[PDB]
Amino acid sequence: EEIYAKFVSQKISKTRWRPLPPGSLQTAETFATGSWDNEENYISLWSIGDFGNLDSDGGFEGDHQLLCDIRHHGDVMDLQFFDQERIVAASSTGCVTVFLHHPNNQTLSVNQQWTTAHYHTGPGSPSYSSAPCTGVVCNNPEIVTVGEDGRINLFRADHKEAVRTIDNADSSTLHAVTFLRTPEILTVNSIGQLKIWDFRQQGNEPSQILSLTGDRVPLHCVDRHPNQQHVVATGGQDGMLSIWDVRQGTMPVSLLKAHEAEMWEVHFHPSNPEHLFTCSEDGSLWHWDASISSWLSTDPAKDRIEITSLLPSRSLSVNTLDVLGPCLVCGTDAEAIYVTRHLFS
């Protein structure tokens, strides 16, 4: 069906759905966003407007209603839900912040904050320099983050300090991070590599490394298939999409062109994961259907992936997406958000 765009008069760097109650029969009712490149950046909670109704006096109540906000510090580099009331966000300040929604009040608050999670160092004094925190992933009650400092941190939603830190896991920027298994993560970098880390190991060095062959394509985003802990998808500086089986050598299994630019997020569908979605600095947003899991076929001219642009035009950059049941949302540099309640009609 048609897609309900909204201007919000801030650039949106990140969007996320509110996690549904286990065993409910609701659609995705609420989403959260984070902003970037303002004089003031914010994190906001929104409801999807109800296009089903008019009352006697003819008003269009079908707007994506703002529930509540809170002001941020720096740019909102990455964003994720932690439970059904708490959210975690990264920052250009190297800060990591946990927030709490108050349904009885319609407000946000801070819940906990790590103001120096990421920082660059220098010769012999604790006059640290700000390092952008680039990505965040949650495994409640646990949390992991990456940054320009090449640091990996492990944090906890009951603890104030770091549970573990790993400085200089790269000499370049680390961009994004995901959990393969609860003590076992994967990160991506400025070189064009996937680095795998096990918090059980007492060294700081990586448990495994994967790459492209020689020429450097920085990898900006990563996801890992919901019912295959060994299948990983990454997005390049060029607009390539790479599918990996982390058990089978050092290279991707499947290599596809997705954009004419930097690909900013990639996601498998949380219930339908033979479906995939991607956004980019080429101004486009795409759906991919492929229904061995079809993502691991070495000949996409035999086995299918059938591919749809969800936007009817190209905008200023699409930084982010999220998809939950039939609902999809994306966020842009055109100071705007796009939402559908239905992706299968």
Add this chain to the structure above:
Amino acid sequence: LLHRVLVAEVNALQGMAAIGQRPLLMEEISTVLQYVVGRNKLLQCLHAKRHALESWRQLVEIILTACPQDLIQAEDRQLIIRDILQDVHDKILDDEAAQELMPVVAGAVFTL
């Protein structure tokens, strides 16, 4: 359903004695269930005999009400009805004859 219900009571009898009598209670459930299979055969037979007699009566009454009088003549049409009446009577004048048939039999004897 009858087996499930009778076995539920042979679970609900919480005692000493019931749990020595349980074999005989399952054995008497077996004779009750066999009698009820007999009752189910009887009802399906009394249906089938009566449904066949109703189908036969329907055929006879079309031969009489709907076939042309120039296809069965004034004497052979009478002999056929005189003979059918005598055969339809004796099978209900015999005292083993099922009473469920009498509303079909008298219903035929009337049209005949």
Add this chain to the structure above:
Amino acid sequence: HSLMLYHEHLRKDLPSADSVQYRHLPSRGITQKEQDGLIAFLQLTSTIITWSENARLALCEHPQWTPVVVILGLLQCSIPPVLKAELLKTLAAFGKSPEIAASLWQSLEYTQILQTVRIPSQRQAIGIEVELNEIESRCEEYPLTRAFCQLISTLVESSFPSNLGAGLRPPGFDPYLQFLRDSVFLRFRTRAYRRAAEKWEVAEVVLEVFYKLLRDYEPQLEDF
């Protein structure tokens, strides 16, 4: 006695945390010659108890062999998933006798080989919900989860206690159905498979359990 000795040894090398320095190789792991011999004896045992009623009872009743407690105890240890699969099949052949099955249901719930009691501080799950997603989903072969589905597939036809899990959690079956539905079945088309057949060998043994659970259930007003 060999199974009790392996249980006694494997449960004693357990890594006490403070011991962070240069260990040697632990020369106490079962070698393949003992593994494949234990597999042959478990498969012999499983055939015998699959047939003979007398041979399920007169092994479970033995106060010095206690085979259910030794086998569930070995399933908690870091042994290979193939040896765990033939151990689970030996339980699946034992669980034909309803007296054994009723005690086995309580023993499975007590041993958390599927973790029904998830603790609010705990990040990693424990038991077969990790081994399926962190061992079998690396090998691309699924003997442990298929043997667990086969264990539940016997233990439904010998029935389950209505009070299963009481005092530790709400009573009843649905935590096992959540694993079979939401961790096995809804995840059978996602996973990769070294055996192109095993994608279907997994589907058989889960849809059998669901079929049995809908065959023998008749609706009652208390369900509502």
Add this chain to the structure above:
Amino acid sequence: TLLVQAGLFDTAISLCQTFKLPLTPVFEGLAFKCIKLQFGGEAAQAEAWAWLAANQLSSVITTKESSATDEAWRLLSTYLERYKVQNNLYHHCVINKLLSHGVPLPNWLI
């Protein structure tokens, strides 16, 4: 161990008395017959009379509310009151056998 599996418990006790043997397997096995009864469908309750009548319970009139499950609890109570000389071990045994099967302890046993 064989008499305990059959359920011939007072002759197993008589044999423990002629050979000094510990009554612990008798108390554990009677508790395990009570556990099998406490989750037992009606065949396991028909099976029970055939060993309850062997344990000489002939001094009880068959009142028509007498569940087979609880004459087994009554026999186990009577043995825990008859054999007092070592009574820690036989309560510890029965309670450990009930708790290892998740069974709540009877009001009289506590």
